[PDB]
Amino acid sequence: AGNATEVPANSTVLSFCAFAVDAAKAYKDYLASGGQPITNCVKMLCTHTGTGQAITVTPEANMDQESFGGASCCLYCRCHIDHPNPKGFCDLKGKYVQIPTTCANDPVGFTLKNTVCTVCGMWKGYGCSCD
């Protein structure tokens, strides 16, 4: 009884960021030890012709991004632990995220290490042209 929501490939990296004091730094280091990054993420069938921003309520990406399901990428909403930012709310859960396809094999590692630029509205560094 109960709908299942996890595949056995992640069963050994979610059960290791679950028990961890800081599961951000404890997942950066999991990849370095030859492990494989988190899969089974949500991938949206957008049109690849949209204003590519980090977080938006509707799938909007360029020809080189790929809009994912926001929650799917927040590692914390993916191993069901507490979010570290004040008040404990996820800035992703509920809003589509668009990852550069250069790294779209493991978005869950992208959002953990990159950062959204405030006024440029895009992924700081991967399009943040703040010259």
Partner: protein, 512 residues
Amino acid sequence: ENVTGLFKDCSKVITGLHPTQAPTHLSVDTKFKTEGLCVDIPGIPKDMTYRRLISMMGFKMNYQVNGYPNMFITREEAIRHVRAWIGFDVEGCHATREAVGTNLPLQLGFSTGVNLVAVPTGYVDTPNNTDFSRVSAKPPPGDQFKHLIPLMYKGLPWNVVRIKIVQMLSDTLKNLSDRVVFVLWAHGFELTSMKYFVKIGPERTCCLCDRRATCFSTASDTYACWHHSIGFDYVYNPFMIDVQQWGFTGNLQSNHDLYCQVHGNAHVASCDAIMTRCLAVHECFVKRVDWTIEYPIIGDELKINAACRKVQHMVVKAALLADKFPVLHDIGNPKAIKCVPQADVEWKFYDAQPCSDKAYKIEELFYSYATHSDKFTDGVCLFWNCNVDRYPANSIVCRFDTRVLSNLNLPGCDGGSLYVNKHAFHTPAFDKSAFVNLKQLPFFYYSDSPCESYVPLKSATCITRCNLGGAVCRHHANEYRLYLDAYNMMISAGFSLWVYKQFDTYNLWNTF
């Protein structure tokens, strides 16, 4: 099967979730999934109020990372940390209303005999963050676990029973070892129930100290050893062994009672934790003294062993030089180490089994009373640290009294206890029926060393020509007091000397 029962949504809501606010792909309902990739439809919006209990059952700690020390250890490094075994059994309830298909821990019990009774809580999934709140439970249907029915009403919130644990481990394991090795049987629902009080991470060090860090604290993000862990929530990096993967078939109560018969309310949450390590202790230590595995020094290890060797070198020489025994038997010494080399008796080594040497012609023999009641009739048999059920009528026994509890004497199987002092001796239960043929030993000191030339001591227990006279010499007063210190320290350590019926302390006097 392509799935797992881990984080399996346990709600009773029919439909799935929106593309966003969906953890994985298998969780987006069939209204959105089209051609292996989800699509957004503005016809239906995302949710704003909902809660979906999450089943944290089926954790797999088979990871490995370059710094992170692993939990599950294998016997040979579980047998080296035997001072830090804590049985662990958690008995749990179910989920009933608007949530079905999951267990969640209710009563926890460790081998310290400590039932803690948490409240049924579980990680629900608000549309913003994975919460941690009460969920309505239902005691397990049946009768063998009937005691769980009136217990679902008298619990504690977790953050008040996460600190009862660390204030309980850090009382037992405070002065035995520097880690915790949960000796758990199922391995199943005992990792669903460690998500709530265990963190892990790279091996860090006690703040304010230098021992290994084995506690955490979400208030002041800082670690501690067992000593400086006052008011600390989580255990740090606990190791844990799984006992039924050592190859046991059948439930616990019928896999334990094959050996021990004094562990008994076998379905509560803490007598199923004492059976969980009384069965790990037994079939890991019961039948050998590995010798090869040294142990760290907790305290008094040198002095207790030195006092034991002194008193053993003492009493056997006294008995031999008193009763003029022609031959002396020996049982249970691994090598051939003659305790009194300056003797006339023939040291026939009736060892239990040959141990790594044949240089001294040690014999192989096992001792039982009904078998060897009339085999040894000549001389005296030295049963130093022997484990026989009953001792013969001519012997010098030193048996460890297993009813004394200390940081050395860990609890063991079948009433017997594990005395881990530089080695692991599994002495069986200390019963009075074993000493029906013997008596206790009086305190005394006898030496043939000539007297040489401060508080005057007058005690008839000391046997020296100087104290026989009016004035006691300073070449025997300090010897008497040091021997008294050794004797009392050993007796407090827990050994118990026994001697044959005809032992007369006066027979030593006429030797002078």
